[PDB]
């Protein structure tokens, strides 16, 4: 069984599954949790950063792609670097050549197509990281969820990483409430933090522990880490 | 141009080469050595375009040195030259030909005979009693055509070169600042440190 | 600039009664300056002779090329290449570089060991083959040679006679050409043997 | 995408055998008989036309092929591998020879060239050897007449006579008695005919035999007149009738 | 070279002279400059002979393959192929071509591809060295929906003039009629067109 | 080693199993076809089976028009069949362009066989599971039928058949030819040859046909075409008044 | 160089002169300008000597291989299409101007190819420096339905026009008749009207006239 | 995937041995025996033919002794085809060296080059090596008479007498037994024959089963003569020695 | 033996290509989507599983347009479908660039077909895990198509695929039998919504979002356009109505 069919991404299992892709999705589950949620005016990212020892840094989980787009990663960091860079380039091109801010929806379509190549090609390897993408553009706020299988989805909110299901159910109820937090960034953030709290077990989210990011109408994608996230606990 | 002469006597090859390097309106140096030892019994003198000159020489040096090692043996003079000719003959049809002319003087330890070969930037090679590149030939060949004898001693050849040098200083337009003489014989290669006044 | 006129030199081959002869001048110079009084231009791979006039560097290069090509041939085929065949090799080898030719004018001479008939031929720098029954001329003094030959020549001469003819043809044609001369060499070719004679000639 | 099969498919087994090569030779064993007998003034190569249906037209298939106007080839093995070996063989006769010397290659050299093609399929990455063995016969001004066999390894050897395929052993034996160094071509054709008869299971006539020769020059086959050096091709495929005329003289 | 193509009620006719020159020598006085790229899509060729033969030969190929794969090609498509070659290779070609063909839905059609590789669809078109001379006449004597008989005349007169004045034109006048009725080959000798 | 049954390399018996499994793929469709030569035409008939009512009947064919003169019928799955058609077309076009005359049937075939021989020798290429029957009326050879298979074999036939019931049809046909002694139906019109064809397919498969059960293709001097359901019917009627 | 082709009732014949030049000097007084592409397809060439022979050998080779591969006799339109396409690829750098004719299963054919790769077809054609002297004649005496005999003359005369009135032509005339049923016949030196008159004197020098310096024997074997 | 069918022809065993080289050396030991004996005025190469018959043409045959250039030859043991490939390339390198230096190539240089090509198949590429082993007999101005040997691993070494192919150990012992530093060509011949005679897996050593070659520097000449014995001559020398 | 299903281009002893077949299962595990051809166009509709309320309504679009007149919908591995569409798009452009007229459906189809079929010829690629229903309007009418992972495709009067496949085809067959006249694109839109709704029962657990799109010679000018607003509710209603 499996042991014969999981040898590469160019092999389908007798059930129609792609094991290498599935194994890839597993590293995401192994990673720290991060949540994304959007109102009609802003989109936030709150992510629990994970340290190695009490003597090291907490791996950065949020990356800025352009002034209007950014993401949070869950999984293999190198792969997020490679993917954020690509999203960085595509954002650049749109600007330089068309003097147009890349549509989040399109940023999505582009990522999906980038991953997919590594999931039908010999010797390659799927990407081992999921991504929560947020952005403000010509049609408002957006939040996209990316999975190495190639599936990208747009939601009002969500979370990924270990224990992600906590916040996912949280937001799923908290929806009617947060989708109306228009014109009040700090609140959405709270809603995000609360959400992120539902996928905790370890210890309470601290200064070196949290990561939040926000983009919106009159707010450029900005990274808040440590000293500044203090007010949101 | 710079001066490059060579004369094969009975037991050696003497190469004499001008010491001047001029660029534009000024003589930049008066002690240049337009020679590289290819192997302990093979010396090559050169003249031509600015950089190509040394670049070509040093390259041929490296290659002959490498062979010597790989085989712990010394290629015959005839061998080095043919090699050299081929590097030039292939260069003439390249993007930027090496614009260098060379005289190769070596003492063939096997045949126990000195040899001098003239090869131009086109890969035109020929073996001779004496030869020259540039305009120098234009005075010296006739001079040597007259005063040369195959059984000359190394000393006799030096004196003959002297003549060649005096004539060139008398009639050539450029001050080439004298020459550097070198003798290639059975015992190797040595520089006549006393030619500026012998 | 005209590659074909820098070094100077001529070659001519004729056919006699069960023989051929091919001769050449010994000069090699750089424009006005005579440089070498010892530059032979006739070569032979086994019993097939090839004389080459033109840019000395190319003359040398092609000899080397034909030695190589003839050598391998002999190893694969296990018999010495024949004139008729060598001619085709030369031709094709020349046309291979149609748009960046070797500035030469080759001449082939020899006697087929099988049939014994005398054979000679000439080619332009890109391979046109000119197989003739009488004579082939090449070099800076081509015109002059064409002049000497066309007149001096007559069919089926014996070796000893052909020698004189080819010689006078070369000799006198050279004397009307500045870039050629400085000594000459003639090859008399017969099935069994081949003789090489050097000629006394004006040294100017 | 792309031929990622960049490694040899024929390796060495711990006993020193090149598997795929021995195997191709087996495929050769399973194929119809073909033979070649060399005479003093000619060579004949023959084989049987294993019509794979009476609905198929035997003539639209040349098991015996002309490589040059003085060299022919016949085989025993996997037909397709042969067809393409012929193409390449005819092409290389030009590219590596007529286009350089202005004359057709002599047999041994053309053989040598075919041979090389086969060897390469024994070592190159991503290919299986050729499932065929060939008998190439020809003539050339300097070596006279010759017959050669080339195996899937790429080995080749010169024969006075031989056979390959199915009934090879028996036939090889039959030839050894009949053959001698004073055979005129007709006699060899005959011998070829006999030796072939023994391998042939059923029908035996010019509609099932493909026998070709390499003999005297045939100007009537040239197609043009006026040039006294090209005396004509020496390779002739016998016609059905020509075979029968010798069959009816069993 | 003198060529033109005229559409009419029943289809379109292509006309041309038959002269090919190397300077002022007449290389061939009976050339056929009317070339088929498809059963009912022909082109009039003017410029380099080599270039135009080369181009036409390729368009025929592309169209043949087009046919096998997707069926009968429109004239417009024949033009696009030509345009593509002429435009994409403008620096190495001297070819001005007129493309005309008949189709059941579109009736007759003419596209002219001048030197820059641009494409122009017109009721009729004229090109070739001798054309300059007939701009006036043709613009004056051309009306739409003419009849085969009429159209044959207009072409015959136009080209006769062109042949008169231009020394680079001459020979006979060839035409090609393309209608539902098929494909007809017309020719007119000097002794007839000269004194028109 | 034991992988010799995965890629086109020899087995110890000297066989290529992938080639052999490919031949078995050809039968996956369950369609029989045959082709016969008239006095100056060539007809091929192949069954047409449209099971699903949701399909557009006119889009189901294993008959392809290769060039103005060459027609080809494929016995094999559709995706491998079409892959073979495209290339045939491409080769025929290229041949015309380079050589100045239309590609002959036998030559197109041989070319197509050669490609096949290659998949038989190179590991990375899988043979295609299809048999190709090329028919036409060659300007130099007369009506023709050349067939090629996954092993890279190709040959010419007086007539031929292909499919699961190859042998049934074959023997029936073989017998017709032993009877007449000539190598072609001795008929003037292709309409009649088409009849003979369908007739014999019936006599051998023991089955009656309707107009949507056949697919016929004919090849005459300077043209090859496929029949309409209606033209076929005109054939189906002409026969149902003879038998 | 002066070459022509004239189609007749059941075939086509071609001819050409035999002079080759290196400028104003006659290199070859009798070179062969007629080339066999295949047994029944011949080409007459003018332009650069080596190019005409090279392009002729090359296409003849590929033609031989197409014949063997297709089991059919070569067709002129094939040689025609291949020559043209080769020449065209070279944008005229291969200075080959040719008249290609011959018989094949489809009939008798006559075409002309220019070094830039344009082709022509006609009942009579000529090319070369002598093209005008020849065409003049052709335009004077050709008529449709010529016999093998008449065409040979027509072609022969035309070449003569060139030989006589064109310095760029000379020596002899070569013909190749390609008749539909028979084997193609190459008539090398059909006509030889420029035979050099017997010399007035003989310059057989008395032996010893030449001064030799040193004499030696050459080794020819291994 | 593709990897699936890759034999990894260039890997090391846990013992630090190259499988394929080892397995090729095995193939070779089943091949006809070739012997080369180096004298003070010649070198002898002799080879025993594998695959015979009454019908095989031995006249126009040369399956084991090849001329690499006028002063060098090789005796082969292994796939005759694999051999030709190497031989053709070795023939060219000889001519390249000639063109470049205008001197005949030194025997060892030729040898080393060939051996390096072999080593290649050993270290990168993923292809099978060549099932071949050579004995090179050549002459040159620097060392004179030389005899060397190369095999699939690409290692080469020099000898005074050597053998390759089947029954190496046997022939070698026999060679070590009767060979002596100051021998002579005519004698080396005998020894060579003798040795083949006592290693042959056949009944008797007949001419038709042998290939013989000598490289002699005749005193009355100066040029090194390479002579590949003709059948009749083999039979003759075979008689002189006494095998008959 | 076995293992005949570990590599994509391998033929099994029965002449099957197992990898292509496993690909199919990946399809079967996906959402349903159908295409109904009508009197002058084609309609496409697909079931969209609403995995959660967090999913923004009407945003994760699945149907795709190729060029301006072709609609594409597929079930299975979504990305694989996207991959096929990108190529679809590139192939159309290539065709338009060279021939000016937009790509004819039959032509477009074969183009997709040959691409997929290609993905079953080598073992260094895995077949596509999608079946695509697509089509549009061209120079001569409407064309509906369906392509399988093997590369097979044929024209359809109606077509469906995914988990609800069977009930859908059931309905589709009803329509073909009852309306031999054809169907007005307006009706088809409705009927599509129906067939989808019913096809949703084979997956009656999660709520769904309906998606339709059409291309009609008189309702959308022969251009592919999605069904929005007024026209969308009408069908959703007609659907929720006949479900009981
Ligand atoms: Mg000259
Ligand atoms: Mg002079
Ligand atoms: Mg006029
Ligand atoms: Mg394969
Ligand atoms: Mg594979
Ligand atoms: Mg289905």
* CATH number of the domain encompassing residue B10: 3.60.20.10
Are the C-beta atoms of residues E59 and E79 closer than 8 Å to each other?
Answer: no
Is C7 in contact with B124 (CB distance < 8 Å)?
Answer: yes
Q: Which structure tokens are listed for E82? A: 């030509």
Eight-state DSSP code of residue D98: I
Instruction: With beta carbons less than 8 A apart as the criterion, state whether B13 and B114 touch.
Output: yes
Q: Which helix (H) or strand (E) segment is B179 a member of?
A: strand B179-185
Touch of H by B (3+ CB pairs closer than 8 Å)? yes
Best I122, I123, I126 residue to mutate vs chain H (most H CBs within 10 Å): I123
d(CA G125, CA E147) in angstroms, rounded, equals 39
User: B132: closest CA among B20, B30, B16, B48?
Assistant: B16
Query: F1-243 has which CATH code?
Result: 3.60.20.10
Sheet holding A152-154, edge to edge: A62-66, A69-75, A129-137, A140-146, A152-154
CA distances from C92 to C48, C103, C125, F47, I69 (A): 17, 15, 11, 58, 59
Q: For residue I54, give the nearest of A58, A178, H24 by alpha carbon.
A: A178
Q: Provide the annotated active-site residues of E.
A: 1
Tell whether I140 lies on the interface with E, counting CB pairs under 8 A.
Answer: no
What separation in Å is there between the alpha carbon of I37 and the centre of ligand 6? Answer: 17
CATH code of A225's domain: 3.60.20.10
* Integer CA distances (angstroms), E21 to E35, E169, E188, F132, G161, in order: 18, 9, 20, 50, 22
The tokens describing H210, both together, are 């042998």
Strand order in the sheet with A42-48: A157-160, A34-38, A42-48, A210-216, A219-225
Nearest CA in chain G to C187: G218
Q: How many domains does chain B have?
A: 1
CA distance G79 to chain F (A): 8
Q: Which residues of G touch F104 (CB under 8 A)?
A: 70, 72
**Structure tokens given for E95:** 């070819």
* CATH code (residue C34): 3.60.20.10
* Superfamily of chain region G1-222: Aminohydrolase, N-terminal nucleophile (Ntn) domain (3.60.20.10)
Separation CA D71–CA D135 (nearest Å): 10
In DSSP notation, E48-107 reads -HHHHHHHHHHHHHHHHHHHHHH-SPPHHHHHHHHHHHHHHTGGG--EEEEEEEEETTTE
Q: Which one-letter DSSP state was computed for residue A233?
A: -
CB spacing of B89 vs C60 below 8 angstroms: yes
G105 interfaces chain D, CB cutoff of 8 Å: no
Task: Tell me how crowded residue C85 is: count the other CB atoms within 10 A of its CB.
Answer: 17
Domain count within chain D:
1
Residue found under tokens 């189906």: F236
Among I103, I137, G84, F69, which Cα is nearest to E66's?
I103
Chain I residues inside the 8 Å CB shell of E76: 100-101
Contact yes or no for H102 and B71 at CB 8 A: no
Place of tokens 């335009």: G139
Nearest C-alpha in C relative to B90: C61
Q: Say if residues E28 and E168 touch (Cβ distance below 8 Å).
A: no
Q: Who among C28, C33, C39 is closest to B138 (CB)?
A: C33
Residues of B in contact with C30 (CB under 8 A): 120
- Does D81 contact F117 at a Cβ distance shorter than 8 Å? yes
CB atoms within 10 A of CB H67: 18
F113 interfacial to chain D (CB closer than 8 Å):
yes
The answer to whether residue C121 neighbours chain D at the CB level (below 8 Å) is: no
For I225, the 3-state DSSP assignment is strand
CA dist., res. F161 & res. H204, Å (int): 60
Query: Would you call I75 helix, strand, or coil by DSSP?
Result: strand
Q: Find which of D226, D230, D232, D235 to mutate to test the G interface (most G CBs within 10 Å of its CB).
A: D226
Q: Which residue range is the domain that position C135 belongs to?
A: 1-204
Q: Do chains F and B touch (3 or more CB pairs under 8 A)?
A: no
Q: Looking up tokens 């063909």, which residue turns up? A: E101
Q: Which domain holds residue B1?
A: 1-198
- SS3 letters for A81-101? HHHHHHHHHHHHHHHHHHCCC
Alpha-carbon I138 to chain mean position: 18
Q: Which of C75, C76, C80 to mutate to test the interface with D (most CBs of D within 10 A)?
A: C76
Q: Which domains does chain H have, with CATH numbers?
A: 1-244 (3.60.20.10)
Per the structure, how many domains does chain C have? 1
Q: Which residues of G are designated catalytic?
A: 1
Residues of F in contact with H2 (CB under 8 A): 124
Spacing, Cα A123 to ligand 4 middle (Å): 21
- Chain H positions touching C67 (Cβ under 8 A) are 98-99
Cα dist from I179 to E34, I37, I146, whole Å: 52, 12, 21
Q: How far is CA H204 from CA H197, H238, I54, in A?
A: 7, 11, 94
D225:G36 CB<8 A: no
Contact F79 I121 (CB under 8 A): no
Subunits adjacent to chain D (3 or more Cβ pairs under 8 Å): C, F, G, H, I
Most distant CA atoms of chain F, gap in Å: 62
Partner chains of H (3+ C-beta pairs under 8 Å): A, B, C, D, F, I
Q: Does D122 touch chain H (CB under 8 A)?
A: yes
Task: Give chains near I: 3+ CB pairs under 8 A.
Answer: A, D, E, F, H
Select the residue from I99, I114, I138, I139 to test the E interface by mutation, using most E Cβ atoms within 10 A.
Answer: I99
Measured distance CA(D143)–CA(D146) in Å, rounded: 8
CA distances from D227 to B184, C70, D24, D99 (A): 63, 28, 46, 20
CA torsion angle G103 G109 G110 G111 (round to 10): -110
Q: Coil, strand, or helix at residue H149?
A: strand
Q: Given the structure tokens 């026209």, which residue do they identify?
A: I231
Compute the distance between CA of residue I242 and CA of residue I244 in angstroms, rounded to an integer.
Answer: 5
Q: Determine contact: I125 vs chain H, CB below 8 A.
A: no
List, as ranges, residues 68-87 from F with C-beta within 8 Å of E.
86
How close is the nearest chain I Cα to the Cα of D6, in Å? Answer: 13
Terminal C-alpha separation, chain A: 48
| Cα dihedral G18, G21, G26, G28 sign | negative
CB atoms within 10 A of CB G28: 19
To one decimal, the resolution in angstroms is 2.2
Q: Which residues contact H182 (CB under 8 A, 6 or more apart)?
A: H40
CB of G84 less than 8 A from some CB of E: yes
> Residue F55's beta-bridge partner residues?
I156
Instruction: Find the CB nearest H100 among B73, B86, B110.
Output: B86
Contact present, F132 and F148 (Cβ < 8 Å)? yes
**If you ran DSSP here, which 8-state letter would residue H179 be given?**
-
User: Alpha-carbon distance H135 to H211, whole Å?
Assistant: 14
Q: Which runs of consecutive H residues, i.e. helices, occur in chain A?
A: 19-30, 77-98, 104-117, 165-178, 185-197
SS3 G185: strand
**How far is residue C85's CA from residue H178's CA, in Å, rounded to a whole number?**
50
- In 3D, which of B124, G19, B93, B90 has the Cα closest to residue C9? B124
Cβ atoms of E96 and E115 within 8 Å: the answer is yes
- Residue B40 corresponds to which tokens in the numbers above? 């302990």
**Total number of domains in chain E:** 1
H8 has a chain F CB within 8 A of its CB: no
Closest CA to F94 of E57, G74, G80: E57
Yes or no: say if A91 and A66 are a contact pair by the CB < 8 Å rule.
yes
* Residue-number span of the structural domain to which A153 is assigned: 1-233
CATH topology of domain I1-244: 3.60.20
Residue G190 has phi, psi (to 5 degrees) of -55, -50
Q: Three-state SS for D220?
A: helix
Contact C57 B122 (CB under 8 A): yes
C-alpha distances in angstroms, A4 versus A11, D160, I2? 9, 56, 12
Helices (H), H80-198: 80-101, 107-123, 168-178, 185-197
Buried b / exposed e along G140-163 (16+ C-beta atoms within 10 A): eebeeebebebbbebbbbbbbbbb
User: How far is the C-alpha of C85 from the C-alpha of F191, rounded, in Å?
Assistant: 61
B161 burial via Cβ count (<10 Å: 0-12, 13-18, 19+): buried
Angle at I66 between CA I60 and CA I69, to 5 degrees: 115
Chain center to CA of D48? 13
Q: Considering every ligand atom, which ligand is closest to the CA of C10?
A: 1
Q: Which two tokens stand for residue E84?
A: 């593509």
Strand ranges (E), chain D: 34-38, 43-48, 65-68, 71-77, 132-140, 144-150, 156-158, 161-164, 209-214, 224-225, 235-237
When CB atoms are compared, the residue of F25, F60, F78 closest to I11 is F25
């Amino acid at each position: 069984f499996r042991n014969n069919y999981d040898g590469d991404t160019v092999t389908f299992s007798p059930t129609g599954r792609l094991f290498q892709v599935e194994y890839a999705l597993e590293a995401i589950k192994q990673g720290s949790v991060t949540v994304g949620l959007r109102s009609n005016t802003h989109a936030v990212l709150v992510a629990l950063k994970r340290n190695a020892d009490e003597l090291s840094s907490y791996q950065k989980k949020i990356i800025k792609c352009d002034e209007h787009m950014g993401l949070s990663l869950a999984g293999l960091a190198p792969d997020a670097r490679v993917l954020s860079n690509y999203l960085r380039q595509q954002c650049n091109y749109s600007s330089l050549v068309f003097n147009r801010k890349l549509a989040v929806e399109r940023a999505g379509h582009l990522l999906c197509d980038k991953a997919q190549k590594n999931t039908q090609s010999y010797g390659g390897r799927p990407y081992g990281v999921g991504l929560l993408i947020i952005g403000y553009d010509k049609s408002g706020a957006h939040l996209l969820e990316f999975q190495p299988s190639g599936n990208v989805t747009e939601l009002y909110g969500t979370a990924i990483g270990a224990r992600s299901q906590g916040a996912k159910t949280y937001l799923e109820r908290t929806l009617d409430t947060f989708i109306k937090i228009d014109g009040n960034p700090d609140e959405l953030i709270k809603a995000g933090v609360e959400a992120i709290s539902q996928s905790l077990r370890d210890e309470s989210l601290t200064v070196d522990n949290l990561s939040i990011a926000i983009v919106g109408k009159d707010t450029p994608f900005t990274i808040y880490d440590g000293e500044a996230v203090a007010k949101y606990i | 141009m710079d001066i490059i002469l060579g004369i094969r006597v009975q037991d050696s090859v003497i190469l004499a080469s001008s010491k001047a390097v001029t660029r534009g309106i000024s003589v930049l140096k008066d002690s240049d050595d337009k020679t590289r030892q290819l192997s302990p019994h093979t010396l090559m003198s050169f003249a031509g375009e600015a950089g190509d000159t040394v670049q070509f020489a040093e390259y041929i040096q490296a290659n002959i040195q490498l062979y010597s090692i790989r085989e712990d043996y010394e290629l015959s003079p005839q061998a080095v030259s043919s090699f050299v000719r081929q590097e030039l003959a292939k260069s003439i049809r390249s993007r930027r030909p090496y614009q260098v002319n060379v005289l190769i003087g070596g003492y063939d330890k096997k045949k126990n005979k000195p040899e001098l070969y003239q090869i131009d930037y086109l890969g035109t090679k020929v073996e001779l009693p004496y030869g020259a590149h540039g305009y120098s030939g234009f005075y010296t060949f006739s001079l040597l055509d007259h005063h040369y004898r195959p059984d000359m001693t190394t000393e006799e050849g030096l004196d003959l070169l002297k003549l060649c040098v005096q004539e060139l200083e008398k009639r050539m337009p450029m001050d080439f600042k004298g020459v550097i003489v070198k003798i290639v014989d059975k015992d190797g290669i040595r520089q006549v440190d006393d030619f500026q006044a012998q | 600039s005209d590659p074909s006129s820098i070094n100077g030199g001529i070659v001519v081959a004729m056919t006699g009664k069960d023989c051929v002869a091919i001769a050449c001048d010994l000069r090699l110079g750089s424009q006005s300056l005579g440089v070498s009084n010892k530059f032979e231009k006739i070569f032979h791979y086994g019993h097939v002779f090839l004389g080459i006039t033109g840019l000395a560097t190319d003359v040398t290069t092609l000899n080397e090329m034909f030695r190589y090509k003839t050598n391998l041939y002999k190893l694969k085929e296990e018999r010495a290449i024949e004139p008729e065949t060598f001619t085709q090799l030369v031709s094709s080898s020349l046309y291979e570089r149609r748009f960046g030719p070797y500035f030469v004018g080759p001449v082939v001479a020899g006697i087929n060991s099988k049939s014994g008939k005398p054979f000679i031929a000439g080619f332009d720098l890109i391979g046109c083959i000119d197989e003739a029954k009488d004579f082939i001329v090449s070099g800076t003094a081509s015109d002059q040679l064409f002049g000497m030959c066309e007149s001096l020549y007559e069919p089926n001469l014996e070796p000893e006679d052909l020698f004189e003819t080819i010689s006078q043809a070369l000799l006198n044609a050279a004397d009307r050409d500045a870039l050629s001369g400085w000594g000459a060499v003639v090859y008399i070719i017969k099935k069994d043997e081949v003789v090489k004679r050097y000629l006394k000639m004006r040294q100017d | 995408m792309t031929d990622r099969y960049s490694f040899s498919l024929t390796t060495f087994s711990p006993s020193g055998k090149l598997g795929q090569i021995d195997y191709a030779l087996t495929a050769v064993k399973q194929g119809v008989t073909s033979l070649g007998i060399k005479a003093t003034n000619g060579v004949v190569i023959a084989t049987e036309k294993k019509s794979s249906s009476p609905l198929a037209m035997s003539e639209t298939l040349s098991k015996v092929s002309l490589l040059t106007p003085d060299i022919g080839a016949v085989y025993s093995g996997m037909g397709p591998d042969y067809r393409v070996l012929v193409d390449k063989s005819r092409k290389v006769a030009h590219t590596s020879y007529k286009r350089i010397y202005g004359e057709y290659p002599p047999t041994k050299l053309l053989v040598s060239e075919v041979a090389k093609i086969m060897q390469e399929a024994t070592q190159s990455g991503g290919v299986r050897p050729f499932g065929v063995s060939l008998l190439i016969a020809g003539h050339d001004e300097f070596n006279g007449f010759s017959l050669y066999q080339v195996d899937p390894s790429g080995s080749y050897f010169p024969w006075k006579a031989t056979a390959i395929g199915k009934g090879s052993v028996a036939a090889k034996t039959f030839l050894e008695k009949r053959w001698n160094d004073e055979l005129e071509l007709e006699d060899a054709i005959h011998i070829a005919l006999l030796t072939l008869k023994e391998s042939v299971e059923g029908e035996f006539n010019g509609d099932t035999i493909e026998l070709a020769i390499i003999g005297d020059e045939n100007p009537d086959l040239l197609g043009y007149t006026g040039i006294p050096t090209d005396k004509g091709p020496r390779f002739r495929k016998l016609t059905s009738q020509e075979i029968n005329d010798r069959l009816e003289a069993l | 070279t003198s060529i033109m193509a005229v559409t009419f009620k029943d289809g379109v006719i292509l006309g041309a002279d038959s002269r090919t020159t190397t300077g002022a020598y007449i290389a061939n006085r009976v050339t056929d400059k009317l070339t088929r790229v498809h059963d009912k899509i022909w082109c009039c060729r003017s410029g380099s002979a080599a270039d135009t033969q080369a181009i036409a030969d390729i368009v025929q190929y592309h169209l043949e393959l087009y046919t096998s794969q997707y069926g009968t090609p429109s004239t417009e498509t024949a033009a696009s192929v030509f345009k593509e070659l002429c435009y994409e290779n403008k620096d190495n070609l001297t070819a001005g071509i007129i493309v005309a063909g008949y189709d059941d839905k579109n009736k007759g059609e003419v596209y002219t591809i001048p030197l820059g590789g641009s494409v122009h669809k017109l009721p009729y078109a004229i090109a070739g060295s001798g054309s300059t001379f007939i701009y006036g006449y043709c613009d004056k004597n051309f009306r739409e929906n003419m009849s085969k008989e009429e159209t044959v005349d207009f072409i015959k007169h136009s080209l006769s003039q062109a042949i008169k004045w231009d020394g680079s034109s001459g020979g006979v006048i060839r035409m090609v009629v393309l209608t539902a009725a098929g494909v007809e080959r017309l020719i007119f000798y000097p002794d007839e067109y000269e004194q028109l | 080693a034991g992988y010799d049954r995965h890629i086109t390399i020899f087995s110890p018996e000297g066989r290529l199993y992938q080639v052999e499994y490919a031949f078995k793929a050809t039968n996956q469709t369950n369609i029989n076809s045959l082709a016969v030569r008239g006095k100056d035409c060539t007809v091929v008939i192949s069954q047409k089976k449209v099971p699903d009512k949701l399909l557009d009947p006119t889009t189901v064919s294993y008959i392809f028009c290769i060039s103005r003169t060459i027609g080809m019928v494929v016995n094999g799955p559709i995706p491998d069949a079409r892959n073979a058609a495209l290339r045939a077309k491409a080769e025929a076009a290229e041949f015309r362009y380079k050589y100045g005359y239309d590609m002959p049937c036998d030559v197109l075939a041989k070319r197509m066989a050669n490609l096949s021989q290659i998949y038989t020798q190179r590991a990375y290429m899988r043979p295609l599971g299809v048999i190709l029957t090329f028919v036409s009326v060659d300007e130099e050879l007369g009506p023709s039928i050349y067939k090629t298979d996954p092993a890279g074999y190709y040959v010419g036939y007086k007539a031929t058949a292909t499919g699961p019931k190859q042998q049934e049809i074959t023997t029936n046909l073989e017998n017709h030819f032993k009877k007449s002694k000539i190598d072609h139906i001795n008929e003037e019109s292709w309409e009649k040859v088409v009849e003979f064809a369908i007739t014999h397919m019936i006599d051998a498969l023991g089955t009656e046909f309707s107009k949507n059960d056949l697919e016929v293709g004919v090849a005459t001097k300077d043209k090859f075409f496929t029949l309409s359901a209606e033209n076929i019917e005109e054939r189906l009627v002409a026969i149902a008044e003879q038998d | 160089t002066t070459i022509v082709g004239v189609k007749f009732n059941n075939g086509v014949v071609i001819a050409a002169d035999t002079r080759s030049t290196q400028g104003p000097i006659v290199a070859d007084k009798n070179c062969a300008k007629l080339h066999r592409i295949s047994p029944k397809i011949w080409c007459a060439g003018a332009g650069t000597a080596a190019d005409t022979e090279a392009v002729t050998q090359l296409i003849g080779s590929n033609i031989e291989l197409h014949s063997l591969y297709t089991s059919r006799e070569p067709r002129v339109v094939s040689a025609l299409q291949m020559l043209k396409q080769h020449l065209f690829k070279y944008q005229g750098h291969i200075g080959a101007y040719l008249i290609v004719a011959g018989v094949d299963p489809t009939g008798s054919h006559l075409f002309s190819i220019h070094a830039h790769g344009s082709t022509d077809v006609g009942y009579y054609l000529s090319l070369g420096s002598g093209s005008l002297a020849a065409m003049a004649v052709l335009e004077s005496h050709w008529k449709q339905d010529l016999t093998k005999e008449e065409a040979i003359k027509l072609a022969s005369d035309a070449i003569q026009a060139g030989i006589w009135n064109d310095l760029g032509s000379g020596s002899n005339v070569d013909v190749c008749v390609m008749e539909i049923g028979k084997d193609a016949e190459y008539l090398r030196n059909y006509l030889t009207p420029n035979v050099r008159e017997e010399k007035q004197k003989s310059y057989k020098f008395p032996r010893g006239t030449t001064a030799v310096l040193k004499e030696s024997i050459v080794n020819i074997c291994d | 995937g593709s990897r699936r069918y890759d034999s990894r022809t260039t890997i090391f065993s846990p013992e630090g041995r190259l499988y394929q080289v080892e397995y090729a050396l095995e193939s070779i030991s089943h091949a006809g025996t070739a012997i080369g004996i180096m004298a003070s005025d010649g070198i002898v190469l002799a080879a025993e033919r594998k695959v015979t018959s009454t019908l095989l043409e031995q006249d126009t045959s040369t399956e084991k002794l090849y001329k690499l250039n006028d002063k060098i030859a090789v005796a082969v043991a292994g796939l005759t085809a694999d051999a030709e490939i190497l031989i053709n390339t070795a023939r060219i390198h000889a001519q390249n060296y000639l063109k470049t230096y205008n001197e005949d190539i030194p025997v060892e240089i030729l040898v080393r080059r060939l051996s390096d090509i072999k080593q290649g198949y050993t270290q990168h590429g993923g292809l099978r090596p060549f099932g071949v082993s050579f004995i090179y007999a050549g002459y040159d101005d620097r060392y004179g008479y030389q005899l060397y040997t190369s095999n699939p691993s690409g290692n080469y070494t020099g000898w005074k007498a050597i053998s390759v192919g089947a029954n190496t150990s046997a022939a070698q012992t026999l060679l070590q037994m009767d060979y002596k530093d100051d021998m002579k060509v005519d004698d080396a011949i005998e020894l060579a024959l003798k040795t083949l005679s006592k290693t042959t897996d056949s009944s008797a050593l007949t001419y038709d089963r042998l290939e013989f070659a000598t490289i002699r520097k005749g005193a009355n000449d100066g040029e090194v003569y390479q002579k590949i014995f003709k059948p009749q001559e083999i039979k003759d020398i075979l008689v002189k020695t006494g095998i008959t | 033996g076995t293992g005949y299903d570990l590599s994509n281009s391998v033929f099994s002893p029965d002449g099957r290509n197992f990898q292509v077949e496993y690909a199919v299962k990946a399809v079967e595990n996906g959402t349903t989507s159908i295409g109904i051809k009508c009197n002058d166009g084609v309609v496409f509709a697909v079931e969209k599983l609403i995995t959660s309320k967090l999913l923004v309504p009407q945003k994760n679009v699945k149907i795709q347009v190729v060029d301006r007149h072709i609609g594409c919908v597929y079930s299975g591995l979504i990305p694989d479908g996207r991959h096929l569409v990108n190529r679809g798009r590139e192939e159309a452009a290539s065709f338009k660039k060279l021939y000016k007229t937009p790509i004819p459906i039959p032509a477009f189809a074969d183009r997709l077909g040959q691409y997929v079929q290609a993905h079953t010829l080598y073992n260094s690629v895995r077949p596509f895990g999608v079946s695509t229903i697509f089509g549009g309007v061209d120079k001569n009418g409407a064309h509906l198509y369906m392509l399988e992972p093997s590369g097979s495709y044929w024209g359809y009067k109606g077509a469906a695929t995914g988990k609800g496949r069977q009930s859908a085809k059931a309905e589709l067959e009803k329509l073909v039998d009852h309306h031999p006249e054809g169907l007005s694109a307006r009706e088809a839109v409705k009927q599509a919504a129906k067939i989808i709704y019913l096809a949703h029962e084979d997956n009656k657990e999660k709520d769904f979002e309906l998606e339709i799109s059409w291309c009609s010679l008189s309702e959308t000018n022969g251009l592919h356009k999605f069904v929005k607003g007024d026209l969308l509710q009408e069908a959703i209603d007609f659907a929720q109505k006949e479900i009981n």
